Amino acid sequence: LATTSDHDFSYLSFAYDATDLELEGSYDYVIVGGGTSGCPLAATLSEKYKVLVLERGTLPTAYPNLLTSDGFIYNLQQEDDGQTPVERFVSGDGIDDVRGRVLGGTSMINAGVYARANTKIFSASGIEWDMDLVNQTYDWVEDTIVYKPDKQAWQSLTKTAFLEAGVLPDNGFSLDHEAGTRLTGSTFDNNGTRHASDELLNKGDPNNLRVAVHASVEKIIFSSNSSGVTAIGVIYKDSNGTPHQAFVRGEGEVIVSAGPIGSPQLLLLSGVGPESYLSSLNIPVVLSHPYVGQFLHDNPRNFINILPPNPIEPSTVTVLGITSNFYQCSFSSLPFSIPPFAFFPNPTYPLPNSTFAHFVNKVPGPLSYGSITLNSDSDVRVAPNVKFNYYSNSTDLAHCVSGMKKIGELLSSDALKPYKVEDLPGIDGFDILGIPLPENQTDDAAFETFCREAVASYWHYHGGCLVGEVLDGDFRVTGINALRVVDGSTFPYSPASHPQGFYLMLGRYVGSKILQERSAA
Numbered sequence: 336l337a338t339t340s341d342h343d344f345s346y347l348s349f350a351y352d353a354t355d356l357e358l359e360g361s362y363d364y365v366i367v368g369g370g371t372s373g374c375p376l377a378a379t380l381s382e383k384y385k386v387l388v389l390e391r392g393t394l395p396t397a398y399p400n401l402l403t404s405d406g407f408i409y410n411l412q413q414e415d416d417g418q419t420p421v422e423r424f425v426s427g428d429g430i431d432d433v434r435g436r437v438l439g440g441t442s443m444i445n446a447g448v449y450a451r452a453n454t455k456i457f458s459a460s461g462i463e464w465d466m467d468l469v470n471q472t473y474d475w476v477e478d479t480i481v482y483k484p485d486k487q488a489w490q491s492l493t494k495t496a497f498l499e500a501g502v503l504p505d506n507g508f509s510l511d512h513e514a515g516t517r518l519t520g521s522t523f524d525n526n527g528t529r530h531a532s533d534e535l536l537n538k539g540d541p542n543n544l545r546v547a548v549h550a551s552v553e554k555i556i557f558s559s560n561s562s563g564v565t566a567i568g569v570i571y572k573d574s575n576g577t578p579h580q581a582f583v584r585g586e587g588e589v590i591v592s593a594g595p596i597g598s599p600q601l602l603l604l605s606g607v608g609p610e611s612y613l614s615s616l617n618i619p620v621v622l623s624h625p626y627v628g629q630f631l632h633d634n635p636r637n638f639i640n641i642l643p644p645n646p647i648e649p650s651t652v653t654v655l656g657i658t659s660n661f662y663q664c665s666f667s668s669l670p671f672s673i674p675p676f677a678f679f680p681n682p683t684y685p686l687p688n689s690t691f692a693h694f695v696n697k698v699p700g701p702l703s704y705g706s707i708t709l710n711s712d713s714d715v716r717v718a719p720n721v722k723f724n725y726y727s728n729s730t731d732l733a734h735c736v737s738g739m740k741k742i743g744e745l746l747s748s749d750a751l752k753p754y755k756v757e758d759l760p761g762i763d764g765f766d767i768l769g770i771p772l773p774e775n776q777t778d779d780a781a782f783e784t785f786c787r788e789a790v791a792s793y794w795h796y797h798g799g800c801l802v803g804e805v806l807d808g809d810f811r812v813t814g815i816n817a818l819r820v821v822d823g824s825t826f827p828y829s830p831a832s833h834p835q836g837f838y839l840m841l842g843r844y845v846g847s848k849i850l851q852e853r854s855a856a
């Protein structure tokens with residue numbers, strides 16, 4: 336774990352704008368997307384080789400509101416205009432959602448909840464894992480951007496309700512995703528500074544790394560020979576319009592780390608994708624990869640909003656109610672005078688005028704998947720369509736009912752009694768904002784309805800470029816040399832209640848693997 340301090344911007348000595356980058360240049364590694372996974376992977380690769388991260392968004396400095404936790408709601412409430420750190424999109428489903436557009440990626444705009452993955456993930460996954468490295472990697476991240484949270488009035492009040500509700504055992508303060516109520520790590524220090532993955536660039540090597548911002552990567556270039564396809568570089572546009580080239584050297588590679596939506600998109604626009612689909616759009620086919628854009632997952636978020644009669648303090652989420660089929664936590668916040676996008680599933684949702692609390696549920700997996708589709712010719716700056724097919728698989732919905740039933744109990748416990756508006760028993764007495772639970776806690780066919788109408792995103796989407804589908808165990812795009820994907824898009828199921836821990840890790844992991852195979856060869 337780390338000691339509270341200022342956000343570390345020493346990496347700016349080697350961060351550039353893309354208008355300030357050479358029109359063409361050679362590197363040992365090119366990393367598209369300077370996000371959650373890119374930054375650590377950049378840092379890692381730079382220890383021993385020449386590296387360039389390329390990032391469509393801005394320095395965090397440009398938008399001072401994502402350096403603190405107070406700003407968390409704010410970033411969401413700001414209009415999307417192409418420049419700002421939060422990109423507003425809606426699914427084919429109709430559910431409002433965001434993703435980051437800033438150096439440090441979505442770890443720069445997120446809720447900052449840290450958790451190490453479910454150990455039982457590592458074995459049933461498709462990659463074979465070095466567990467001395469994984470664990471030692473978590474150390475390296477934690478030792479830098481992860482902090483032990485201080486008691487907070489409202490959160491400890493949620494710990495007690497979870498333990499009263501049945502969520503056992505009490506694990507105390509622990510980083511490991513296990514079953515039971517616990518108090519987990521956060522990327523918000525005890526002054527409320529945001530520490531995100533941009534700071535892991537500082538863990539790099541200043542003499543070897545070159546970050547670039549406002550570099551929208553448009554195309555991955557390939558080479559005919561010899562004898563098979565290889566990545567040679569990428570093309571990116573600067574803010575003026577000028578396209579630049581970045582090339583890989585002998586023995587080098589290009590690594591896409593643009594997230595569930597970015598990677599499938601860049602690959603598809605570069606003509607690695609399902610043949611009949613690319614033809615359909617007149618995109619020249621470079622390798623027929625049927626599974627690119629496929630198997631996109633997003634865990635449904637189902638919640639209850641309460642408006643206590645007395646005010647409650649805003650909190651950063653640190654207390655978690657982990658059960659096998661779903662995960663829970665609770666957010667308290669100042670009122671909303673302008674709606675923060677993606678918090679609620681549509682913009683016409685009532686806003687809270689006083690302080691309120693938000694009890695949420697996240698189904699694991701999930702099992703239901705969808706698809707990335709392009710709709711703009713090529714324009715990388717045009718957000719692709721995604722469909723997630725919420726509650727399409729009947730098991731996701733069972734776990735929703737369960738989880739909502741369990742929130743029903745959270746509301747019944749002795750801890751929540753001072754937050755009811757009147758002294759009515761059970762779940763009644765709460766002043767509800769938006770859609771309330773079913774009255775009868777034994778009405779399956781009614782809770783199923785709740786789950787389906789109330790659903791929003793947990794923002795934890797992942798998929799679209801799976802190992803054992805598009806990538807091999809080393810994270811290579813199969814049948815293409817020198818091309819790799821590392822990020823949210825690489826696995827079909829969520830690693831924990833909260834994924835950034837896994838992804839931050841997954842970045843420096845693949846780093847060391849690549850570095851290793853550079854010494855054993």
Ligand SMILES: Cc1cc2nc3c(=O)[nH]c(=O)nc-3n(C[C@H](O)[C@H](O)[C@H](O)COP(=O)(O)OP(=O)(O)OC[C@H]3O[C@@H](n4cnc5c(N)ncnc54)[C@H](O)[C@@H]3O)c2cc1C
Binds near residue numbers: 372447449715794824
């Ligand atoms: C509102 C919100 C809150 C969240 N809160 C939590 C939390 O509390 N705890 C937790 O564990 N997880 C949380 N998450 C999820 C977690 O932060 C993400 O799943 C994690 O960031 C994984 O992202 P990634 O590394 O795959 O890609 P990202 O971190 O999104 O990185 C992708 C980067 O690549 C860039 N990019 C995209 N396309 C291009 C292009 N073609 N050219 C150049 N650059 C490009 C983007 O600008 C972006 O910066 C939250 C997510 C959201 C949306």
